[PDB]
């Protein structure tokens, strides 16, 4: 399962 | 007995040719099992291994949502990083990302990973402690302070120690007949003369899974690492891999040379000579 969408760079 | 799950993100801008492309693939050890390509007709998380097909609609919907959100976030990030380096709008650039977990034979977390690159250069990586960052330059320091403010490291630690290990254990069970089956290589040795005084000995390994293998030539029982041509391990297309090691030997001296093969699927490590 993917990790949840992280923060923008 | 030891295993890994890794996901790989590639976000590539193409100015003048539309919006940046976002691609996500997932592996368990050397087996791909999911993919997402934002260029697809219908962008969705799609199966790539039979043992993942049995997951239910919530799984496919959630993983597709993460990936569709990631598509827009990676577009924002390519623009941000272009700013951080004073780059013009004309060039194409790539963010790559790799994260995942290693578990031991019992299934307990060995270590977690999360690393990013920009145009192929290391940019920022989660440290082994799953709680601090290593930034490669003053641009990645901006990303680091954003990620500290977002508690990104904390959220990734929770994932890497929780969901990552738990789903990996689930996948290794659902796909045990392949993921947990090591196929030994089929081996042989060949002999091609180059001249009147020298010949090439080539040790072959075929049909093995996983890709991890050790092929070495010895002369009088001593390693020929300097003199061995090692081709890069290559996929056969049927899940298995291929490799060869080659040494150039004086004519007549062939029998002082043994090829040694180590692979998880082998009962015992192998020693091979040329058999004329």
């Amino acid at each position: 399962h993917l990790a949840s969408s992280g923060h923008s760079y | 007995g030891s295993h890994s799950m890794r996901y790989f993100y590639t976000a590539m801008s193409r100015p003048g040719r539309g919006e940046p492309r976002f691609i996500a693939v997932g592996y368990v050890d050397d087996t791909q099992f999911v993919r997402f390509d934002s260029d697809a007709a219908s962008p969705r998380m799609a199966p790539r291994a039979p043992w993942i097909e049995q997951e239910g609609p919530e799984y496919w919907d959630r993983n597709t949502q993460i990936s569709k959100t990631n598509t827009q976030t990676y577009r924002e990030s390519l623009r941000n990083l272009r700013g951080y380096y004073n780059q013009s709008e004309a060039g194409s650039h790539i963010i790559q990302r790799m994260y995942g977990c290693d578990v031991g034979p019992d299934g307990r977390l060995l270590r977690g990973y999360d690393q990013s690159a920009y145009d192929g250069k290391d940019y920022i990586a989660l440290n082994e402690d799953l709680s601090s960052w290593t930034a490669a330059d003053t641009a990645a320091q901006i990303t680091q302070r954003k990620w500290e403010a977002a508690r990104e490291a904390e959220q990734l630690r929770a994932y890497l120690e929780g969901l990552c290990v738990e789903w990996l254990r689930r996948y290794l069970e659902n796909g045990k007949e392949t993921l947990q089956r090591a196929d030994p290589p089929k081996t042989h040795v060949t002999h091609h003369p180059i001249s009147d005084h020298e010949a090439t000995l080539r040790c072959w390994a075929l049909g093995f899974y996983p890709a991890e293998i050790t092929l070495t030539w010895q002369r009088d029982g001593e390693d020929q690492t300097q003199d061995t041509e090692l081709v890069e391990t290559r996929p056969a297309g049927d899940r298995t891999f291929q490799k060869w090691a080659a040494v150039v030997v004086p004519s007549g001296e062939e029998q002082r040379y043994t090829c040694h093969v180590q692979h998880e699927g082998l009962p015992k490590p192998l020693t091979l000579r040329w058999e004329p």
């Binding site: - | 790989f8 590639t10 590539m12 691609i23 693939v25 592996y27 791909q32 993919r35 390509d37 790539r48 194409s92 790539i94 790559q96 790799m98 690159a117 145009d119 192929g120 250069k121 290391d122 060949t190 091609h192 080539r202 075929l206 081709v231 890069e232 290559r234 996929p235 056969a236 297309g237 049927d238 291929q242 060869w244």
Partner: protein, 100 residues
């Protein structure tokens, strides 16, 4: 700004037997950036309906892809792989060497 040129290997999935179906593989690796053109050639002409693996990359961030198609080798037919990349001044052609 950091570009790496592809490594190319041309080989068959199974050991080659004239008259018997098989797969012809062209594996390109070690390259950056990711845009690449790979064609499989039968006696110098492009083959239709080649497929390729999904894009991924190695620990050192360089990309790799496998291009493959079904084929049955004969003794007369020659096969090769034709690769173009930003690092290459003109397409590179790598012949299938059977004994390798």
């Amino acid at each position: 700004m950091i570009q790496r040129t592809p490594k190319i290997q041309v080989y068959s999935r199974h050991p080659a037997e004239n008259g018997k179906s098989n797969f012809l593989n062209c594996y390109v690796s070690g390259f950056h950036p990711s845009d690449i053109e790979v064609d499989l050639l039968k006696n110098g002409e492009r083959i239709e309906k080649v497929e390729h693996s999904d894009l991924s990359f190695s620990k050192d961030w360089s990309f790799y892809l496998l291009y493959y198609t079904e084929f049955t080798p004969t003794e007369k037919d020659e096969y090769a792989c034709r690769v173009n990349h930003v690092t290459l001044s003109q397409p590179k052609i790598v012949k299938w060497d059977r004994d390798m």
